[PDB]
From a paper:
Phytoglobins (Pgbs) are plant-originating heme proteins of the globin superfamily with varying degrees of hexacoordination. Pgbs have a conserved cysteine residue, the role of which is poorly understood. Class 1 Pgbs are distinguished by a weak hexacoordination (KH ≈ 2) compared to Class 2 Pgbs (KH ≈ 100).
After purification, the two phytoglobins, WT and Cys86Ala, were successfully crystallized. The conditions for crystallization differed slightly, indicating minor differences in the surface properties of the two proteins. The monomers in the dimers showed antiparallel orientation, with the heme groups at the opposite ends of the dimers. However, it is well within the 19 Å distance limit that enables electron transfer on ms timescale. Therefore, it is plausible that these two residues, Tyr 115 and Cys 86, are both involved in maintaining the redox stability of the iron. Undoubtedly, the conserved cysteine present has a protective role against autoxidation and may be involved in direct electron transfer from the heme iron, affecting the oxidation state.
Numbering used by the authors: 6 to 51, 63 to 161
Write the structure that this text describes.
């Protein structure tokens, strides 16, 4: 497991509560940053699907932070992990795409809540994001065999 503190969860929960006021705009900013860095990713999404996908990234990472605090591990149901993993595989999503998305997510948060930004805030989001991404792949691995 990992030790993910009440303070770390509160950073994620509290910044998301502030950013939620502008969730549609923030979702667009996230994808604008992703597509600025790696425009080739735009082809995967050839917009209401972009809106839903950005919201999934934010809300699913938030829920991963809550599960890390509560359980030391990500506890998403297997059908949800299996869906994300199969869809990502189908579309050719590889590690670099997750890495660019993480980078863009953290930049987006930093600009959305400059008054809360700090190394601790960055690391709390990043840890929750990384554990969700790893959890999808561990579920896809349980099914590769
Ligand atoms: C932790 C990070 C991510 C989470 C939580 C996440 C979540 C999701 C979910 C819930 C879906 C299903 C949408 C549906 O069934 O309609 C989905 C689909 C998809 N994801 Fe992700 N995703 C992540 C990362 C990525 C990344 C890094 C890429 C590529 C840069 C990507 C590209 C796609 C595409 C192309 C689809 C299918 C089209 C769409 O639903 O818009 N995803 N993702």
């Amino acid at each position: 497991t990992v030790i993910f503190t009440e303070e770390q969860e509160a950073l994620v929960v509290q910044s998301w509560n502030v950013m939620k006021k502008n969730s549609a705009e923030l979702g667009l900013k996230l994808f604008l940053k992703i597509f600025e860095i790696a425009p080739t990713a735009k082809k995967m999404f050839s917009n209401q699907k972009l809106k839903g996908h950005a919201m999934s990234v934010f809300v699913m990472t938030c829920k991963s932070a809550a599960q890390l605090r509560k359980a030391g591990k990500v506890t998403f149901g297997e059908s949800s992990l299996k869906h994300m993993g199969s869809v990502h595989l189908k579309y050719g999503v590889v590690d670099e795409h997750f890495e660019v998305t993480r980078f863009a997510l953290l930049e987006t948060i930093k600009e959305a809540v400059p008054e809360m930004w700090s190394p601790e805030m960055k690391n709390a989001w990043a840890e929750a994001f990384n554990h969700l991404v790893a959890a999808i792949k561990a579920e896809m691995q349980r099914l590769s065999t």
